[PDB]
Ligand binder design. Structure first.
Ligand code: U5G
Ligand code: U5G
Lengths: 306, 306
């Protein structure tokens, strides 16, 4: 029993972090096989940031301008290239700690673990969600660039995020491991709009199910509702619309608790219209939306990983 | 920028988890050098739990009754002993992945990372605090026993907790790595009282400092207070008294923000007396007490570990 914001074990990713230096800038790289991946603005100076021409900036860098370093051992770059917003440094030594891995571009509302690193060295791990506006609410300081988000599927690490930049309200933007940004962001220091952040309704429902599984039942009411009627209310409190897929995804949690999804929607409806009047649910005084239905099943049934 | 409930990287602890089986029971062990550590009630059957006599139960176990297993490799027990509530299984193979480590008994209010495991395999990592009543609010299912809490100091893992048991309200009790319980709990299935849980005031203050460092300043008021006057109010909302030590510990956070501790106490005072009126602080609608001043410094300045 119990419910906690839980990250994946980070052992398999720790051995893949190196330190990348180009002239003055130092940040983190991801070393898999004989390739190191890092944000391409490592080739920028502070002034270049306002309006970088990456092609032109890259023209005047040779392999020997890139200092790659795994612990005290020192790797040498035999080739570099730009793939979108990431730089791929080809090195002379395949990582002997390369795990089984994939690169995946995740969808908004999915969650993942971030291993925050500085100078190629792990500092900490936490779980976060891709917000519907394609930002994340992370914890990143200067030097954290190149830190990666990941999931695990048994033995296979799925890399999905690389950290690049911060936006005014302490929210964070980055790319997938192919260098494509999530959202409309670009890697330069010029004013940029993030859209409105909405609440991931299906995640809220899964967390309400986790509450119930852990005996926190007071919000369970006696009403029901329809999917169209719920969405009419959710959309006014800035919530994602619920679809029949979402209902199907919640099936396992609905079947374990004996509470139908539409019944749960009616309880959520009331929580949005009346607030929570001072109680908490699973120790929280807000509705939590950074647990997917999979995260809840995994945590409330004990899925392990190699 | 940003503030997250952050766990230590778990790589160095993952390689120390094994699976321990005795007759019917299977749980987790901690394998360091040639010793495996596990909860001693692994030698119990479901019936023995109501009133185990561990000495007598242990009398009828020999080395070959204990199946220890690291992945697919299979270790053999050449000796067993009971140290308080833990069992120390002497094995024939020193763990080649033993990190530099210590055993520490932590004090209430300190935080640590838990690597929740099942069948000797890491499932996830999260951060928690030793509550003032010597429980933790974790996330543990059947099979999680033997999972360990730890901190890191650069290269040295400090093991501080081993999970044993759950109490009615989904709170958890366990031992240090020498087998002594935290709190007055004993390892048998008989009614047992946990005391009242109080709020760790110095942790709340450090989190308020983290708020301010991250620009969340609305609760900063124009009043001040005295340590005796604050404690008179804190003690009525079930808060730990603040001492001059606590003030000294907060010095680094006070110096970074320019807000004196007593001034911060006056803001906290008002938050306890008026509630937070609907806003949030660092995304939370409750006062958070599971960040030590050290956790805040570490996260808001970027301490890394080997
Ligand atoms: C990494 O590059 C690093 N070296 O660690 C760094 C990390 C961030 C998180 C704390 C600083 N990222 C940048 O410096 C990033 C690079 C320039 C400027 N960057 C920013 O994140 C800036 N944000 C910003 O300009 N935001 C908008 C575009 C105005 C919304 C900072 C002001 C935070 C430095 C580039 C290429 C975007
Ligand atoms: C571990 O032993 C395991 N094998 O994983 C197990 C983990 C807990 C967390 C989910 C079950 N612990 C126990 O089974 C533990 C062992 C018996 C009974 N235990 C309990 O935790 C019981 N709690 C309990 O009796 N609580 C009090 C004492 C009434 C407050 C359960 C009812 C949860 C099984 C012993 C030796 C205490």
């Amino acid at each position: 029993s119990g419910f906690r914001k839980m990250a994946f074990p980070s052992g398999k990713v720790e051995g893949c972090m190196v330190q990348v230096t180009c002239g003055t800038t130092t940040l983190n790289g991801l070393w898999l096989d004989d390739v190191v991946y890092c944000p391409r603005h490592v080739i920028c100076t502070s002034e270049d940031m306002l309006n970088p021409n990456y092609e032109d900036l890259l023209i005047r860098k040779s392999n020997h301008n890139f200092l790659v370093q795994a612990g005290n051992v020192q790797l040498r770059v035999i080739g570099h290239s730009m793939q979108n917003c990431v730089l791929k440094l080809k090195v002379d030594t395949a990582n002997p700690k390369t795990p089984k891995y994939k690169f995946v571009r995740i969808q908004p509302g999915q969650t993942f673990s971030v291993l925050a690193c500085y100078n190629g060295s792990p500092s900490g791990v936490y779980q976060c969600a891709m917000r519907p506006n394609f930002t994340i609410k992370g914890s990143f300081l200067n030097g954290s660039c190149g830190s990666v988000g990941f999931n695990i599927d048994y033995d296979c690490v799925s890399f999905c995020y690389m950290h690049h930049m911060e936006l005014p309200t302490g929210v964070h933007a980055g790319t997938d491991l192919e260098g494509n940004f999530y959202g409309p962001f670009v890697d330069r220091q010029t004013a940029q709009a993030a859209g409105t952040d909405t609440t991931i309704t299906v995640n809220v429902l899964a967390w309400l199910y986790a509450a119930v599984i852990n005996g926190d039942r007071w919000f369970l009411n006696r009403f029901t509702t329809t999917l169209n009627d719920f969405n009419l209310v959710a959309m006014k409190y800035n919530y994602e619309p619920l679809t029949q897929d979402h209902v199907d995804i919640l099936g396992p949690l609905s079947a374990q608790t004996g509470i139908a999804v539409l019944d749960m929607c009616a309880s959520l409806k009331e929580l949005l219209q009346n607030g929570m009047n001072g109680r908490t649910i699973l120790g929280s005084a807000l509705l939590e939306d950074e647990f997917t239905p999979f995260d809840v099943v995994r945590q409330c049934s004990g899925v392990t990983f190699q």
